[PDB]
Amino acid sequence: PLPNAVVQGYTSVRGPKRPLDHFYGRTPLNIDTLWHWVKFPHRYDNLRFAVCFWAFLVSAHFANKKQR
Amino acid sequence: IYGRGSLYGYRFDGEIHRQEAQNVILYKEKEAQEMAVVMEKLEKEIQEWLKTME
Numbered sequence A: 001p002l003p004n005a006v007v008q009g010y011t012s013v014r015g016p017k018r019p020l021d022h023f024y025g026r027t028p029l030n031i032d033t034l035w036h037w038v039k040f041p042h043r044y045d046n047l048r049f050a051v052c053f054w055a056f057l058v059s060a061h062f063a064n065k066k067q068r
Numbered sequence B: 001i002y003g004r005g006s007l008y009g010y011r012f013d014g015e016i017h018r019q020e021a022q023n024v025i026l027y028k029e030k031e032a033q034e035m036a037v038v039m040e041k042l043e044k045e046i047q048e049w050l051k052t053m054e
Ligand SMILES: CCCCCCCCCCCCO[C@@H]1O[C@H](CO)[C@@H](O[C@H]2O[C@H](CO)[C@@H](O)[C@H](O)[C@H]2O)[C@H](O)[C@H]1O
Pocket: A001, A002, A006, A007, A008, A009
């Protein structure tokens, strides 16, 4: 269907590709290496429960007062 | 949503419900306009009755 040149990526000569840099002494920084710096939220979960309760309650209070 | 009691939006809001304030303003204006006339009439009647008898 397609020629071998198109498959292998070169007509006559295979050109050298410059390898990827590593930056020895530190972690790689790529779009896929970000969980090393940003994990899932784990510090303020209980505060999340409390604040969701208080938000629901205060909103319900003011909505009922407005409606009434 | 829980406090409103409605899942779509508030109730008793809208120009149909806001216009009732202006309707009340006009109704009170008319009511005071008629009440002043009626009170003046009744006061004239009472001042007549008193100055005739007393
Ligand atoms: C199958 C029915 C008949 C229809 C046939 C034609 C279908 C064409 C649609 C598929 C196209 C795929 O297109 C494909 O693109 C990639 C790019 O990622 C090319 O990839 C090429 O270049 C890259 C870099 O650029 C080289 O690293 C790689 O070795 C080389 O394959 C493929 O050589 C080509 O095949």
